[PDB]
Design a protein around this ligand. Structure first.
Ligand SMILES: [Cl-]
Ligand SMILES: [Cl-]
Ligand SMILES: [Cl-]
Ligand SMILES: [Cl-]
Ligand SMILES: [Mg+2]
Ligand code: NA
Ligand code: NA
Ligand code: NA
Ligand code: NA
Ligand code: NA
Ligand code: NA
Ligand code: NA
Ligand code: NA
Lengths: 123, 123, 123, 123
RNA sequence: CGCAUGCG
RNA sequence: CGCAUGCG
């Protein structure tokens, strides 16, 4: 068994840079994983992908496609006070949110400002 | 149900320029699509990607990543007489081939000259 | 011996466009070069890079990599009133600041608004 | 102590992709290193850089600026049959050689084709 | 500004 | 085509 915090840190230590869309995806993956008791399945898939020589980024995409909790799942809403609260290497990946975004199509999360404005983070 | 020619024309209508590396990708997509009877699935993915705000170029890339026939597929080899047979706008995207290229990693096709020399087309 | 104004004019005469990130880099280079009495050394590096085939943009970058005053240097903070004060052609190169930015890693300057919000200019 | 083969492989293992300008720089560094008996210092410098959190690419550039054999050193000439013999991710880094290329200014090597054409590899 | 790698 | 990272 692995905790959410421990798994996030393992995943973060494989990712280039900081505050990228993949860093946000790690947080999303680990929260949904925790809530669905999928953390060990997720961890196993991550390790196996690395073992096969896949990039960490590739491994995270594959998790959203292969682990059941993410299949046909909507991105979580993340409430923020301002655009400045969005991770610092994600700003160019924001788009208006479509009617039915799916995590397995690259919609990581939906940021929601205090006036209710939303911005979708897309890989 | 959609013709390969018709789907090609739809795709081309969305693309900037003429004879670009993405026009070459359209042709590869339509050939492999026709052969696998996947043209309707391909047309659906193209439209779904455009609908969620993807550029036409990105929508084509999404097809290679999401439609089963392109999964792990090696690029076709296209035999040519000279480098002049390659559309001029594709020339900036030409590069030597790797050991085991995959369409879903950006390798559209491999051009091969009479003397066996090759030039890969990478988006 | 060369003045900061003369060097800036030489550099500008090489650059395309108006109000680009590279124009701001010139201003940063000439200021820190004036302060450190490095203008002749900067000038020599600029000319030496051009002579070996670097673009003017690349030659300005080579100065930040090669001239001692720019080594690990933190970028200057420029106080502004609105994001509209930042030249239009620079807008594409703006992003949030990292923990400890350095000129020789591409951080030209940091624009700061009255309320303390910041925008880093990254080449 | 370390051998030239063991050092190359250590360095290669840290580099992204294959056949890049940095892969060629590894071969150059270990060749001139071996010939000048600088392998242990080169290894020491590479490890310290990585320990500081520098990228392997950064570490290799620092070697060319810090290790005496590379200071003001001419790039080696590599005799090849045709452009196809150049490493597969170096083609876009080739340019005409200036009068006096230096490794510490990023001139990794000069390829000499059988037809007489010279092409310098520039980082 | 450009190259390389990763990802879509 | 775009984004991210690294390098010049
Ligand atoms: Cl906003
Ligand atoms: Cl449709
Ligand atoms: Cl403003
Ligand atoms: Cl290693
Ligand atoms: Mg983050
Ligand atoms: Na990181
Ligand atoms: Na067109
Ligand atoms: Na091959
Ligand atoms: Na590698
Ligand atoms: Na280059
Ligand atoms: Na990278
Ligand atoms: Na790329
Ligand atoms: Na970059």
């Amino acid at each position: 068994d692995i905790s959410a915090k421990d798994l996030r840190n393992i995943m973060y230590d494989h990712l280039p840079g900081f505050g990228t869309a993949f860093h946000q995806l790690v947080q999303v993956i680990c929260k949904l994983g925790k809530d669905s008791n999928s953390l060990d399945i997720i961890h196993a898939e991550f390790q196996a992908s690395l073992a096969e020589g896949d990039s960490p980024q590739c491994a995270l995409i594959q998790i959203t496609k292969r682990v059941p909790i993410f299949q046909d799942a909507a991105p979580p809403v993340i409430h923020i006070r301002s655009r400045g609260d969005i991770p610092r290497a994600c700003q160019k990946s924001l788009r208006p949110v479509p009617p039915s975004p799916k995590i397995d199509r690259g919609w990581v999360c939906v940021f929601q400002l205090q006036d209710g404005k939303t911005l979708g983070l897309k890989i």
